[PDB]
Amino acid sequence: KVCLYLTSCVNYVPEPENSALLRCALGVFRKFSRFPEALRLALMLNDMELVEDIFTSCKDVVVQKQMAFMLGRHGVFLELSEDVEEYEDLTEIMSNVQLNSNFLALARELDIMEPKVPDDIYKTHLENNRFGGSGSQVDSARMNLASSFVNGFVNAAFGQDKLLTDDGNKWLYKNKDHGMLSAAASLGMILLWDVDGGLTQIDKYLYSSEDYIKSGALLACGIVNSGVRNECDPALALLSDYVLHNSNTMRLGSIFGLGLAYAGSNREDVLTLLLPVMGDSKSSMEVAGVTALACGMIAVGSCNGDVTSTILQTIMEKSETELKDTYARWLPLGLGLNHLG
Amino acid sequence: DRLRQTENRATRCKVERLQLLLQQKRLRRKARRDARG
Secondary structure, three states, rough: HHHHHHHHHHHOOHHHHHOOOOOOOOOOEEEEOOOOOOHHHEEEEHHHHOOOOOHHHHHHHOOOOOOOOOOOOOHHHOOOOOOOOOOOHHHHHHHHOOOOOOOHHHHOOOOOOOOOOOOOOOOOOOOOOOOOOOOOOOOOOOHHHHHHHHHOOOOOOOOOOOOHHHHHHHHHEEEEEEHHHHHOOOOOOOOOOOOOHHHHHHHHHHHOOOHHHHHHHHHHHHOOOOOOHHHHHHHHHHHHHHHHOOOOHHHOOOOOHHHHHOOOOOOHHHHHHHHHHHHOOOOHHHHHHHHHHHHHHOOOOHHHHHHHHHHHHHHOOOOOOOOOHHHHOOOHHHHOOOOOO | HHHHHHHHHHHHHEEEEEEEEHHHHHHHHHHHHHHHH
């Protein structure tokens, strides 16, 4: 029962904390009481993890899931004046950064798996054009994008296919502007969590003569940082300059990296960065929708200013029309996403 | 074409600076681990 959650989840709290001193089996199961009670109890996990200081290892196991396994949250909340014991290791854990992620995945994918994966999942149909006469009938220019997404999909964790996306490179300048955008995310979604090495592989596309390829490389920089809090902020530092770049489509997608790499936290700087497009009464509806899909879920919390901006921007063009579901496709989705969960 | 050349030059000097800072932080991280082992 709802009122029975509000007392049972807080009645869990003093039992393994006061009576027992297990002090790590509780915090894995005390995120149940994060949302229904209050934000104060949602942060008192960080509080009584701070005030408990029995050696180092057992509390390091507690913050190993506050790393990035449910919600980082206090992953920038520890440092005060180099006061917490092993602060620099606790921060390297909660940030998901390199040796606590990429190394591991690398330490599996080189040593337990096959690091080739050269699109053979879409090349295992070697027995189908002999089935039922002959083949070579489909000439539609849509298989190329889907095959591009497939071969850029399974090559995660350092399976970088340099000089293999040259079909995608030639399709950048040929046709399918949607597909030209969706093909440039292949290298970004191929070096997921390699923030330190992935930027050097994406760099070659940031100077492209095509807005689709350059936008897809900006989206790749966002994708690489998803779930990893790096001290150099390379996603914010590269995507910032493009958020307000032009009024057309390239205006539309340019926010989205900030919508992805900074969606599990709460910082005001990206919020006032992405706010002016959301609050200028711009009538291009898909731009407004994708900016709402970013800004309504940059922080899944209780940001009332973003709530007021979303609702005002909605009542800014939705009212005098009786038309399709695109009006409700993204902006009320973000308004729901502000306090969802 | 001139705007895009100034833009790509500004982006470049931003990326070249970020790569140096990431490499310096990565080397500091590694030096802490290699001193603990």
